[PDB]
Amino acid sequence: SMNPPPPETSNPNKPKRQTNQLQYLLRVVLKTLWKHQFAWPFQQPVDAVKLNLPDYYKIIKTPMDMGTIKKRLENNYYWNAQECIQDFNTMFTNCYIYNKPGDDIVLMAEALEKLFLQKINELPT
């Protein structure tokens, strides 16, 4: 099988706006995670063909990655911050579903998730 198309990063039917919280998700949260030593597996959609994972998109039907999130934020795709937080949580949960506890990539996702939650908590009033 082919790869699926990547998640949409624009949608002409979906109202969109910029908010202070979404600006913070791009300029602080995404930027901090993107620069982390463990970011690289998450910077683009899973290429199941190149990785020889014919079952990845049989198991993972809601894919997400930080390249898609970065584009969504840059494109002002979202209406609210909780939508974008959900995209990060989908990305982490996918890793935990396909892999097993204690696997290398799971420890990498767990470290990024800890940092993600710290940066969200630091959002100033």
Ligand X SMILES: COc1cc(C(=O)N2CCC(N3CCN(C)CC3)CC2)ccc1Nc1ncc2c(n1)N(C1CCCC1)c1ccccc1C(=O)N2C
Binding site for ligand X (CB under 6 A): 40-42, 46, 51, 53, 95, 98-99, 104-105
Nearer to ligand X, 24 or 98 (CB): 98
How far is the C-alpha of 116 from the C-alpha of 103, rounded, in Å? 20
In the complex, the smallest distance separating the C-beta of residue 110 from ligand X, rounded to whole angstroms, is 12
Residue 73 in contact with residue 28, Cβ under 8 Å? no
In the complex, the smallest distance separating the C-beta of residue 88 from ligand X, rounded to whole angstroms, is 13
Nearer to ligand X, 57 or 79 (CB): 57
In the complex, the smallest distance separating the C-beta of residue 33 from ligand X, rounded to whole angstroms, is 13
Nearer to ligand X, 49 or 123 (CB): 49
- End-to-end C-alpha distance for the chain, whole angstroms: 48
Nearer to ligand X, 21 or 39 (CB): 39
In the complex, the smallest distance separating the C-beta of residue 94 from ligand X, rounded to whole angstroms, is 7
How far is the C-alpha of 67 from the C-alpha of 44, rounded, in Å? 5
